[PDB]
mmCIF file of C-alpha atoms in Angstrom:
data_model
loop_
_atom_site.group_PDB
_atom_site.id
_atom_site.type_symbol
_atom_site.label_atom_id
_atom_site.label_comp_id
_atom_site.label_asym_id
_atom_site.label_seq_id
_atom_site.Cartn_x
_atom_site.Cartn_y
_atom_site.Cartn_z
ATOM 1 C CA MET B 1 -6.271 77.090 37.319
ATOM 2 C CA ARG B 2 -5.610 77.209 41.084
ATOM 3 C CA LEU B 3 -6.308 74.411 43.262
ATOM 4 C CA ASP B 4 -6.690 75.810 46.936
ATOM 5 C CA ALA B 5 -7.191 73.643 50.041
ATOM 6 C CA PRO B 6 -10.462 73.752 51.699
ATOM 7 C CA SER B 7 -10.726 76.367 54.485
ATOM 8 C CA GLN B 8 -12.512 76.832 58.026
ATOM 9 C CA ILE B 9 -12.231 73.315 58.887
ATOM 10 C CA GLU B 10 -14.456 72.876 61.968
ATOM 11 C CA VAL B 11 -15.138 69.945 64.122
ATOM 12 C CA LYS B 12 -18.676 69.768 65.623
ATOM 13 C CA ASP B 13 -20.977 67.581 67.675
ATOM 14 C CA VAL B 14 -18.009 65.801 69.263
ATOM 15 C CA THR B 15 -19.278 62.749 71.219
ATOM 16 C CA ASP B 16 -16.994 60.080 72.658
ATOM 17 C CA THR B 17 -16.931 58.022 69.478
ATOM 18 C CA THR B 18 -18.202 60.323 66.812
ATOM 19 C CA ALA B 19 -17.553 63.899 65.380
ATOM 20 C CA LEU B 20 -18.921 66.096 62.364
ATOM 21 C CA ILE B 21 -16.120 67.557 60.346
ATOM 22 C CA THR B 22 -17.097 70.621 58.103
ATOM 23 C CA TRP B 23 -15.393 72.813 55.712
ATOM 24 C CA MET B 24 -15.684 75.609 53.137
ATOM 25 C CA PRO B 25 -14.719 74.454 49.603
ATOM 26 C CA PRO B 26 -12.034 76.232 47.620
ATOM 27 C CA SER B 27 -13.110 79.047 45.068
ATOM 28 C CA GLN B 28 -12.430 76.921 41.999
ATOM 29 C CA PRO B 29 -14.055 73.678 40.718
ATOM 30 C CA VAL B 30 -12.748 70.494 42.093
ATOM 31 C CA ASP B 31 -13.645 66.848 41.658
ATOM 32 C CA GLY B 32 -13.997 66.202 45.219
ATOM 33 C CA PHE B 33 -12.036 65.930 48.582
ATOM 34 C CA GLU B 34 -10.018 63.507 50.497
ATOM 35 C CA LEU B 35 -10.420 63.683 54.288
ATOM 36 C CA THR B 36 -7.734 61.740 56.289
ATOM 37 C CA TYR B 37 -8.324 61.124 60.012
ATOM 38 C CA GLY B 38 -6.600 59.062 62.811
ATOM 39 C CA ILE B 39 -5.134 59.325 66.230
ATOM 40 C CA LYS B 40 -2.860 62.270 66.138
ATOM 41 C CA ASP B 41 0.271 60.558 67.889
ATOM 42 C CA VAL B 42 -0.338 57.196 65.938
ATOM 43 C CA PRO B 43 1.083 57.798 62.409
ATOM 44 C CA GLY B 44 -0.100 54.210 61.591
ATOM 45 C CA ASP B 45 -3.630 55.112 62.187
ATOM 46 C CA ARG B 46 -4.730 56.897 59.225
ATOM 47 C CA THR B 47 -8.141 56.464 57.240
ATOM 48 C CA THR B 48 -8.813 58.331 54.078
ATOM 49 C CA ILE B 49 -12.370 59.032 52.943
ATOM 50 C CA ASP B 50 -13.314 59.991 49.483
ATOM 51 C CA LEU B 51 -15.843 62.872 49.035
ATOM 52 C CA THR B 52 -17.530 64.446 45.965
ATOM 53 C CA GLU B 53 -17.299 68.164 45.401
ATOM 54 C CA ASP B 54 -20.740 68.671 46.564
ATOM 55 C CA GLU B 55 -19.874 67.298 50.020
ATOM 56 C CA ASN B 56 -18.771 69.795 52.493
ATOM 57 C CA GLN B 57 -19.135 67.780 55.721
ATOM 58 C CA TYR B 58 -18.509 64.252 56.904
ATOM 59 C CA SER B 59 -19.358 62.468 60.220
ATOM 60 C CA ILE B 60 -16.714 60.133 61.465
ATOM 61 C CA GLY B 61 -17.511 57.224 63.705
ATOM 62 C CA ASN B 62 -16.038 54.515 65.753
ATOM 63 C CA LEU B 63 -13.498 56.793 67.429
ATOM 64 C CA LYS B 64 -11.706 56.301 70.753
ATOM 65 C CA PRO B 65 -13.116 58.019 73.711
ATOM 66 C CA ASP B 66 -10.922 60.827 75.275
ATOM 67 C CA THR B 67 -8.407 60.642 72.412
ATOM 68 C CA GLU B 68 -6.743 63.346 70.418
ATOM 69 C CA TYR B 69 -7.368 63.139 66.640
ATOM 70 C CA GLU B 70 -6.238 64.934 63.610
ATOM 71 C CA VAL B 71 -8.139 65.553 60.487
ATOM 72 C CA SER B 72 -6.674 66.316 57.274
ATOM 73 C CA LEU B 73 -8.666 67.684 54.109
ATOM 74 C CA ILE B 74 -7.532 68.038 50.468
ATOM 75 C CA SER B 75 -9.027 69.413 47.377
ATOM 76 C CA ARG B 76 -8.951 67.053 44.513
ATOM 77 C CA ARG B 77 -8.954 67.596 40.684
ATOM 78 C CA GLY B 78 -7.753 65.099 38.203
ATOM 79 C CA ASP B 79 -4.710 63.273 39.773
ATOM 80 C CA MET B 80 -3.980 66.775 41.351
ATOM 81 C CA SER B 81 -4.164 67.541 45.118
ATOM 82 C CA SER B 82 -4.133 70.843 46.921
ATOM 83 C CA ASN B 83 -1.992 71.062 50.115
ATOM 84 C CA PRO B 84 -3.722 69.683 53.157
ATOM 85 C CA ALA B 85 -5.821 71.766 55.528
ATOM 86 C CA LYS B 86 -5.663 70.274 59.123
ATOM 87 C CA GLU B 87 -7.596 70.574 62.518
ATOM 88 C CA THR B 88 -7.144 68.628 65.799
ATOM 89 C CA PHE B 89 -9.807 67.683 68.264
ATOM 90 C CA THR B 90 -10.336 65.508 71.338
ATOM 91 C CA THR B 91 -13.372 63.082 71.646
ATOM 92 C CA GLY B 92 -15.298 63.138 74.965
ATOM 93 C CA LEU B 93 -15.451 60.582 77.706
#
């Protein structure tokens, strides 16, 4: 059974400290997703959020204003993970 990564990762409603991350789930069943986000140029700043399979969006808060972030999404299925799907965005003043 394949385990594709989500697709069409979009970043919406970007404010100075928040942003809505959306995505299209894979075409196979999964147990959920794992969304990692943090300041792009700061490898040490990475937070990973656990999502159920019926969740296709997540609103991230407490972000740094005017800063470039990178989001990464992985599909999950029993100890197994898909490759990550990524997107970059910059918060607004």
